[PDB]
Amino acid sequence: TKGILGRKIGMTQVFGENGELIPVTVVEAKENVVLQKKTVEVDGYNAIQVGFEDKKAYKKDAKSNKYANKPAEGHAKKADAAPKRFIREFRNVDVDAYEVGQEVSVDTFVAGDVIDVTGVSKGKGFQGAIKRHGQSRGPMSHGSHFHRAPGSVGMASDASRVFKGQKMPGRMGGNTVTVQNLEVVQVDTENKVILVKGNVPGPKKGLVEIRTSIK
């Protein structure tokens, strides 16, 4: 059950019980609303749909993503909501405990909840096989002309080809990764933040999704 969306703000630390130091990610989860319920009798699977950060009302002749278009406005008009910057769907909740238009608030998580946290990782561009994978380099003296290349990429006349999935250079970076079994350290209702013990994927101010851990 229990998901929510936030922006990752940054990392600090907190002193816990008997002075143990705890490194902490502060996540600002402000102004979530339930935009839609999806059901097994209309869509074939039970889920809810949450929008996260509100943006400006539709304006004639606007170019950027700061303003809603007409479809986004009509979608957020069914619930009595403002248009939202990000929208995701949650399948682990119980769809009967929710109402379209209601606010998902930060205090649905309590301190001590173990959570899973999803984000898109940072982004690094074209990287080679030493950084992208864990490959080891060649000798840097003794006549070597082999330093940061990959090694051989196949055998010979048998398999006169390269197998799929071969670990070559290429673009390293922004994939969606969850970490499992992180936990809530404290929840701050007034500032609307969660503190998560650990670090979470993604750059600063990028979207994160928190769910209740399964395992």
Q: Which stretch binds other proteins (CB under 8 A): 15-23, 31-39, 141-149, 168-176?
A: 15-23
Spatial CA neighbour of 132 closest among 170, 166, 177:
170
Site for RNA in 64-103 (CB under 7 A): 64-66, 69-72, 74-75, 77-78, 85, 87, 89
169 lies in the binding site for RNA (CB under 7 A): yes
Alpha helices (runs of H) in the chain, residue ranges in sequence order: 70-78, 129-132
191 touches RNA by CB under 7 A: no
Q: Kindly state whether residue 59 participates in binding RNA, applying the rule CB under 7 A.
A: yes
Distance in angstroms (rounded) separating the CA atoms of residues 75 and 13: 40
3 state SS of 63: coil
CA distance 171 to 68: 32
Least distance from other proteins to the Cβ atom of residue 17, Å: 10
Amino acid letter for position 130: I
Q: Does 165 bind RNA (CB under 7 A)?
A: yes
Enumerate long-range contacts of 160-166, CB under 8 Å, 24 or more apart: none
3-state secondary structure of 196: strand
Q: Enumerate residues 5-34 that contact RNA by CB under 7 A.
A: 10-13, 21, 23
Residue 170 binds which one of RNA, other proteins, none, with CB within 5 to 8 A depending on kind?
Answer: RNA
Closer to other proteins by CB, 90 or 109: give it: 109
Write down the least CB distance from residue 14 to RNA, Å: 9
Residues 20-39 that bind other proteins (CB under 8 A): 20-21, 26, 28
Chosen residue from 97, 138, 186, 188 binding RNA by CB under 7 A:
138
Q: How far is CA 167 from CA 70, 129, 131, 159, 164, in A?
A: 45, 7, 11, 17, 9
Kind of pairing between the strands at 207-212 and 193-197: unpaired
Stretch that binds RNA, among 98-106, 172-180, 185-193 (CB under 7 A): 172-180
State how far the Cα of 32 lies from the Cα of 214, in Å rounded to an integer.
22
Q: How far is the CB of 43 from other proteins (least distance, A)?
A: 36
Instruction: Tell me whether residue 213 is annotated as binding.
Output: no
Query: Least separation, in Å, of the C-beta of 13 and RNA?
Result: 4
Strand partners, 49: 36, 89
Question: Which residues of this protein are in contact with other proteins, per CB under 8 A?
Answer: 9-10, 12-15, 18-21, 26, 28, 188, 191, 193, 195
